[PDB]
């Protein structure tokens, strides 16, 4: 397959949108849902098959030889390259990990395996790499946009994990978590497993976002020991991320 | 009209002062007032007619040709240029948007339309551009002053919007907002729609200012779900603004 | 007088120490004391006479001509230069402003005049200028040390002013201030005008210091409307100061 | 002894691991333990004897001559160099400072002397110096990693000291400390000297880490006057450390 082909470019954009959706949904899937509900069933399936098509197409596309800028259309070379680079993980990731979880005795570890899907963000990474290679956009502006996307995605994933760490404790001993002890205004999170999904997600995202900016107000904070450790890890990584963002912005203004 | 004319320069300064007042007052107009009170009536009218005169004058003045530095005084060219660039928005914004709101059944969308008047900040933007063009002031210092003004104005507008988001909820369900749940010292905001305008404005501005500096104390925070989303958007934009300011300062120090 | 004379250098160091003490004490004098207590009386007088001697000596020393590097010892030139630049304010600030306050009906404005002494920091400013001129120390390191001293001194002055703003309210209506509403641990600041000076000073300095670093915990915050305005001004100035410090550090690492 | 000898390199790595352990444990030993519990007895002795062996070996190895790059193996020179630079305090710190404390009337000052052992971090310092000398790693990346390690270690030591400052007060007057007044969720630190070591350490580390990132939430803050002073010193030093880290990152991005 000719790499720049008009149809292949459209397929790349389509799979990029699907990858963005899957990367944004999988942490939500794992954290806010101890097993998918019925309505999204078919949705999950089509996503899988969509990525399946991508696999059955990834065996066909020719690859640029990095050391020597020469295209290769031999099927053996491309097959072997896919085999070593990005085959086993995509295959193990597009398995149906929800029906497996429900059927196989509801063992959590098999869902813990649901995080295996996150390397679909490699599609967005390659998107940003191509955008950097393009001359219409400045290199450092592309780098900063990539960093902003990375910060937003890490904040979203951290919010999902932070909510998940509240469901680890038994439901009876729930007042000892970050959520369930909140009393914002007149609303008290008495039973936080019966509230609407969007309310809990927005609360967790609000906490994660105000922690990343470094405002830290203090209305939502850590109570458990696991939540404390997660908060320390998150802020330690966030500080370096923010320093890097400031560094690239300063670099463009100084040199660009 | 000769572009550099002494009288036209005085008119430009007068319109700049009026535009600064209008830009600082329109968010206050929209947020803190569900309809103007009677006292400022004539004041509002005066501003409108002033800008009307500006529009009448904006047609007469000749324009500089950017691609080829030749000044052209033909009325048709300046008329067409003003028609294309900055005519429709200025006129639609110079309509009386207060008496219309009161007469036409007190509908909210027409008052939402009052935000059109913020395009008068283009006058301050052009003023800073002229200051940058002037050789008496360093370019990066001008950029940093512009950035500081942008940060202050965005903080003021964010404070106005944050107070407005508290009035969206019905008056009976008011303890579920950022204001109305405050208990700073001995003063509790029991009925926050009966307090003086300056107290509410100062409280909102205090919250917005301590959120922008990133102190985030935590005496004033978000409670509603709409307030949470607004806070996330505010801090996400403010982080980039502050990083840009730090980059500009470091740029002048390193290079200048 | 020969500018580099060994005795004059010792006198300069002596007056530098006295100026540092006076600059650190005058905000404390104004804020924490509605009139000096008896014990420090003679101390105050001593400082005055010391600075008196300084100005008496300052009329004698020769001055360097910046435009043309030619030293002048003609007393008329140095006398006129001192009359022009730095005479009137030192004289008016070296008046006894405590006995004047106590004798003249305890009027508050004459005590507000006590802030004139803050221009003794010009001694430290010139000290840092000389240190920058010296080749033993790197220029940007000297600039950063000066910036850190400025930040610390501004924090100390802001703490003094913040405590003073709590004493403007009447003693009966004291629970509406930043102090007097504190309940840190088991200690409640019931009557904050009868507590030891060091406790109140340390509380105010703790608030100011954690506001400057941008931690902002939220145990000590603003309640009054005047305190809110002071906090906004302080954080707005502190943000620029911190950005400048980051810029200078980055400059030395990048270029030095 | 030949400096680059592989057995000596293995010994250096072994002593480096022991030094990392000792540096991470000594603040914990001093703060969280008023005398070691019996179980770690032999462990302590082992560390001591290990460092003893290091001292015994440190005499044998030849030293690089900095001014003139000639290797000298004469035992008198390496001896005198060790006697001058880094022995007296290595030995004084290699003394058994726990059994001394228990036997000699449980006097606190000899335990304060336990802080001498922190200069085993010179091993990690020389670790990073050699890594900087190595050409496989960029110099500024090595500096950034060293700064990150310094920040983490200073945070750990500050957490240990902050917990120690809570034990200085008598156990009866314990509610006036940073710990013992905590009411995180349903858990109240009623008697904080009976809780598990890991819970107290994690709480102190959580406070120190969120103070360093500058989030400052406000659930754990200072109450005592000693804690206030320690917090001011910590944040004043941490601000400079963070500015230095941002400067190094920006320099690497701009120049490298
Ligand atoms: K806070
Ligand atoms: K903060």
PDB file of N, CA and C in Angstrom, chain A residues 143-190:
ATOM      1  N   UNK A 143       5.398  21.182  19.999  1.00  0.00           N
ATOM      2  CA  UNK A 143       5.832  20.526  21.230  1.00  0.00           C
ATOM      3  C   UNK A 143       4.985  20.966  22.418  1.00  0.00           C
ATOM      4  N   UNK A 144       4.664  22.258  22.491  1.00  0.00           N
ATOM      5  CA  UNK A 144       3.892  22.775  23.616  1.00  0.00           C
ATOM      6  C   UNK A 144       2.450  22.290  23.555  1.00  0.00           C
ATOM      7  N   UNK A 145       1.870  22.229  22.356  1.00  0.00           N
ATOM      8  CA  UNK A 145       0.532  21.658  22.231  1.00  0.00           C
ATOM      9  C   UNK A 145       0.528  20.195  22.656  1.00  0.00           C
ATOM     10  N   UNK A 146       1.571  19.450  22.283  1.00  0.00           N
ATOM     11  CA  UNK A 146       1.680  18.057  22.701  1.00  0.00           C
ATOM     12  C   UNK A 146       1.780  17.947  24.217  1.00  0.00           C
ATOM     13  N   UNK A 147       2.574  18.819  24.838  1.00  0.00           N
ATOM     14  CA  UNK A 147       2.699  18.811  26.291  1.00  0.00           C
ATOM     15  C   UNK A 147       1.382  19.149  26.972  1.00  0.00           C
ATOM     16  N   UNK A 148       0.642  20.111  26.424  1.00  0.00           N
ATOM     17  CA  UNK A 148      -0.651  20.456  27.002  1.00  0.00           C
ATOM     18  C   UNK A 148      -1.621  19.285  26.901  1.00  0.00           C
ATOM     19  N   UNK A 149      -1.631  18.597  25.756  1.00  0.00           N
ATOM     20  CA  UNK A 149      -2.470  17.410  25.628  1.00  0.00           C
ATOM     21  C   UNK A 149      -2.050  16.333  26.621  1.00  0.00           C
ATOM     22  N   UNK A 150      -0.743  16.146  26.800  1.00  0.00           N
ATOM     23  CA  UNK A 150      -0.254  15.137  27.736  1.00  0.00           C
ATOM     24  C   UNK A 150      -0.669  15.484  29.159  1.00  0.00           C
ATOM     25  N   UNK A 151      -0.560  16.759  29.531  1.00  0.00           N
ATOM     26  CA  UNK A 151      -0.976  17.183  30.863  1.00  0.00           C
ATOM     27  C   UNK A 151      -2.464  16.944  31.074  1.00  0.00           C
ATOM     28  N   UNK A 152      -3.286  17.301  30.084  1.00  0.00           N
ATOM     29  CA  UNK A 152      -4.729  17.115  30.222  1.00  0.00           C
ATOM     30  C   UNK A 152      -5.073  15.635  30.338  1.00  0.00           C
ATOM     31  N   UNK A 153      -4.453  14.796  29.505  1.00  0.00           N
ATOM     32  CA  UNK A 153      -4.740  13.368  29.553  1.00  0.00           C
ATOM     33  C   UNK A 153      -4.266  12.738  30.856  1.00  0.00           C
ATOM     34  N   UNK A 154      -3.089  13.136  31.342  1.00  0.00           N
ATOM     35  CA  UNK A 154      -2.606  12.614  32.614  1.00  0.00           C
ATOM     36  C   UNK A 154      -3.503  13.057  33.758  1.00  0.00           C
ATOM     37  N   UNK A 155      -4.015  14.287  33.697  1.00  0.00           N
ATOM     38  CA  UNK A 155      -4.968  14.744  34.703  1.00  0.00           C
ATOM     39  C   UNK A 155      -6.248  13.919  34.667  1.00  0.00           C
ATOM     40  N   UNK A 156      -6.753  13.625  33.468  1.00  0.00           N
ATOM     41  CA  UNK A 156      -7.961  12.814  33.347  1.00  0.00           C
ATOM     42  C   UNK A 156      -7.742  11.404  33.893  1.00  0.00           C
ATOM     43  N   UNK A 157      -6.612  10.787  33.540  1.00  0.00           N
ATOM     44  CA  UNK A 157      -6.305   9.452  34.042  1.00  0.00           C
ATOM     45  C   UNK A 157      -6.106   9.460  35.551  1.00  0.00           C
ATOM     46  N   UNK A 158      -5.456  10.501  36.077  1.00  0.00           N
ATOM     47  CA  UNK A 158      -5.260  10.608  37.516  1.00  0.00           C
ATOM     48  C   UNK A 158      -6.587  10.772  38.238  1.00  0.00           C
ATOM     49  N   UNK A 159      -7.520  11.524  37.654  1.00  0.00           N
ATOM     50  CA  UNK A 159      -8.849  11.637  38.245  1.00  0.00           C
ATOM     51  C   UNK A 159      -9.553  10.287  38.274  1.00  0.00           C
ATOM     52  N   UNK A 160      -9.454   9.528  37.180  1.00  0.00           N
ATOM     53  CA  UNK A 160     -10.068   8.201  37.153  1.00  0.00           C
ATOM     54  C   UNK A 160      -9.468   7.289  38.218  1.00  0.00           C
ATOM     55  N   UNK A 161      -8.138   7.289  38.342  1.00  0.00           N
ATOM     56  CA  UNK A 161      -7.481   6.441  39.334  1.00  0.00           C
ATOM     57  C   UNK A 161      -7.821   6.901  40.746  1.00  0.00           C
ATOM     58  N   UNK A 162      -7.914   8.214  40.955  1.00  0.00           N
ATOM     59  CA  UNK A 162      -8.229   8.736  42.276  1.00  0.00           C
ATOM     60  C   UNK A 162      -9.634   8.345  42.698  1.00  0.00           C
ATOM     61  N   UNK A 163     -10.588   8.365  41.766  1.00  0.00           N
ATOM     62  CA  UNK A 163     -11.910   7.857  42.114  1.00  0.00           C
ATOM     63  C   UNK A 163     -11.869   6.357  42.367  1.00  0.00           C
ATOM     64  N   UNK A 164     -11.093   5.615  41.573  1.00  0.00           N
ATOM     65  CA  UNK A 164     -11.024   4.171  41.769  1.00  0.00           C
ATOM     66  C   UNK A 164     -10.495   3.825  43.152  1.00  0.00           C
ATOM     67  N   UNK A 165      -9.503   4.577  43.628  1.00  0.00           N
ATOM     68  CA  UNK A 165      -8.929   4.315  44.942  1.00  0.00           C
ATOM     69  C   UNK A 165      -9.942   4.510  46.061  1.00  0.00           C
ATOM     70  N   UNK A 166     -11.044   5.211  45.796  1.00  0.00           N
ATOM     71  CA  UNK A 166     -12.104   5.338  46.783  1.00  0.00           C
ATOM     72  C   UNK A 166     -13.017   4.120  46.823  1.00  0.00           C
ATOM     73  N   UNK A 167     -13.127   3.380  45.723  1.00  0.00           N
ATOM     74  CA  UNK A 167     -13.959   2.187  45.676  1.00  0.00           C
ATOM     75  C   UNK A 167     -13.240   0.938  46.164  1.00  0.00           C
ATOM     76  N   UNK A 168     -11.925   1.012  46.380  1.00  0.00           N
ATOM     77  CA  UNK A 168     -11.195  -0.133  46.914  1.00  0.00           C
ATOM     78  C   UNK A 168     -11.658  -0.471  48.324  1.00  0.00           C
ATOM     79  N   UNK A 169     -11.891   0.545  49.148  1.00  0.00           N
ATOM     80  CA  UNK A 169     -12.367   0.316  50.499  1.00  0.00           C
ATOM     81  C   UNK A 169     -13.777  -0.273  50.472  1.00  0.00           C
ATOM     82  N   UNK A 170     -14.137  -1.068  51.478  1.00  0.00           N
ATOM     83  CA  UNK A 170     -15.477  -1.645  51.502  1.00  0.00           C
ATOM     84  C   UNK A 170     -16.528  -0.559  51.589  1.00  0.00           C
ATOM     85  N   UNK A 171     -17.724  -0.807  51.050  1.00  0.00           N
ATOM     86  CA  UNK A 171     -18.769   0.230  51.078  1.00  0.00           C
ATOM     87  C   UNK A 171     -19.168   0.658  52.478  1.00  0.00           C
ATOM     88  N   UNK A 172     -19.102  -0.241  53.462  1.00  0.00           N
ATOM     89  CA  UNK A 172     -19.430   0.144  54.830  1.00  0.00           C
ATOM     90  C   UNK A 172     -18.437   1.144  55.403  1.00  0.00           C
ATOM     91  N   UNK A 173     -17.146   0.967  55.138  1.00  0.00           N
ATOM     92  CA  UNK A 173     -16.110   1.875  55.615  1.00  0.00           C
ATOM     93  C   UNK A 173     -15.764   2.865  54.506  1.00  0.00           C
ATOM     94  N   UNK A 174     -16.754   3.673  54.128  1.00  0.00           N
ATOM     95  CA  UNK A 174     -16.614   4.604  53.017  1.00  0.00           C
ATOM     96  C   UNK A 174     -16.355   6.036  53.442  1.00  0.00           C
ATOM     97  N   UNK A 175     -16.607   6.379  54.700  1.00  0.00           N
ATOM     98  CA  UNK A 175     -16.418   7.741  55.154  1.00  0.00           C
ATOM     99  C   UNK A 175     -14.959   8.089  55.359  1.00  0.00           C
ATOM    100  N   UNK A 176     -14.077   7.140  55.060  1.00  0.00           N
ATOM    101  CA  UNK A 176     -12.642   7.297  55.255  1.00  0.00           C
ATOM    102  C   UNK A 176     -11.924   7.535  53.929  1.00  0.00           C
ATOM    103  N   UNK A 177     -12.665   7.906  52.892  1.00  0.00           N
ATOM    104  CA  UNK A 177     -12.105   8.162  51.573  1.00  0.00           C
ATOM    105  C   UNK A 177     -12.159   9.654  51.265  1.00  0.00           C
ATOM    106  N   UNK A 178     -11.516  10.036  50.159  1.00  0.00           N
ATOM    107  CA  UNK A 178     -11.574  11.428  49.719  1.00  0.00           C
ATOM    108  C   UNK A 178     -12.999  11.830  49.369  1.00  0.00           C
ATOM    109  N   UNK A 179     -13.730  10.945  48.702  1.00  0.00           N
ATOM    110  CA  UNK A 179     -15.142  11.129  48.440  1.00  0.00           C
ATOM    111  C   UNK A 179     -15.912  10.343  49.491  1.00  0.00           C
ATOM    112  N   UNK A 180     -17.128  10.785  49.771  1.00  0.00           N
ATOM    113  CA  UNK A 180     -17.890  10.269  50.880  1.00  0.00           C
ATOM    114  C   UNK A 180     -17.712  11.047  52.162  1.00  0.00           C
ATOM    115  N   UNK A 181     -16.638  11.826  52.269  1.00  0.00           N
ATOM    116  CA  UNK A 181     -16.461  12.785  53.345  1.00  0.00           C
ATOM    117  C   UNK A 181     -16.680  14.216  52.881  1.00  0.00           C
ATOM    118  N   UNK A 182     -16.927  14.427  51.590  1.00  0.00           N
ATOM    119  CA  UNK A 182     -17.180  15.764  51.079  1.00  0.00           C
ATOM    120  C   UNK A 182     -18.529  16.275  51.564  1.00  0.00           C
ATOM    121  N   UNK A 183     -18.579  17.562  51.887  1.00  0.00           N
ATOM    122  CA  UNK A 183     -19.809  18.236  52.282  1.00  0.00           C
ATOM    123  C   UNK A 183     -19.897  19.594  51.605  1.00  0.00           C
ATOM    124  N   UNK A 184     -19.634  19.618  50.300  1.00  0.00           N
ATOM    125  CA  UNK A 184     -19.638  20.858  49.532  1.00  0.00           C
ATOM    126  C   UNK A 184     -21.026  21.488  49.507  1.00  0.00           C
ATOM    127  N   UNK A 185     -21.163  22.670  50.097  1.00  0.00           N
ATOM    128  CA  UNK A 185     -22.464  23.314  50.175  1.00  0.00           C
ATOM    129  C   UNK A 185     -23.441  22.465  50.964  1.00  0.00           C
ATOM    130  N   UNK A 186     -24.654  22.310  50.435  1.00  0.00           N
ATOM    131  CA  UNK A 186     -25.667  21.479  51.070  1.00  0.00           C
ATOM    132  C   UNK A 186     -25.616  20.025  50.629  1.00  0.00           C
ATOM    133  N   UNK A 187     -24.808  19.692  49.626  1.00  0.00           N
ATOM    134  CA  UNK A 187     -24.739  18.328  49.123  1.00  0.00           C
ATOM    135  C   UNK A 187     -23.636  17.572  49.850  1.00  0.00           C
ATOM    136  N   UNK A 188     -24.020  16.508  50.547  1.00  0.00           N
ATOM    137  CA  UNK A 188     -23.083  15.605  51.199  1.00  0.00           C
ATOM    138  C   UNK A 188     -23.069  14.287  50.444  1.00  0.00           C
ATOM    139  N   UNK A 189     -21.871  13.797  50.127  1.00  0.00           N
ATOM    140  CA  UNK A 189     -21.715  12.558  49.365  1.00  0.00           C
ATOM    141  C   UNK A 189     -21.927  11.384  50.318  1.00  0.00           C
ATOM    142  N   UNK A 190     -23.193  11.162  50.677  1.00  0.00           N
ATOM    143  CA  UNK A 190     -23.516  10.098  51.623  1.00  0.00           C
ATOM    144  C   UNK A 190     -23.179   8.732  51.041  1.00  0.00           C
TER     145      UNK A 190
END
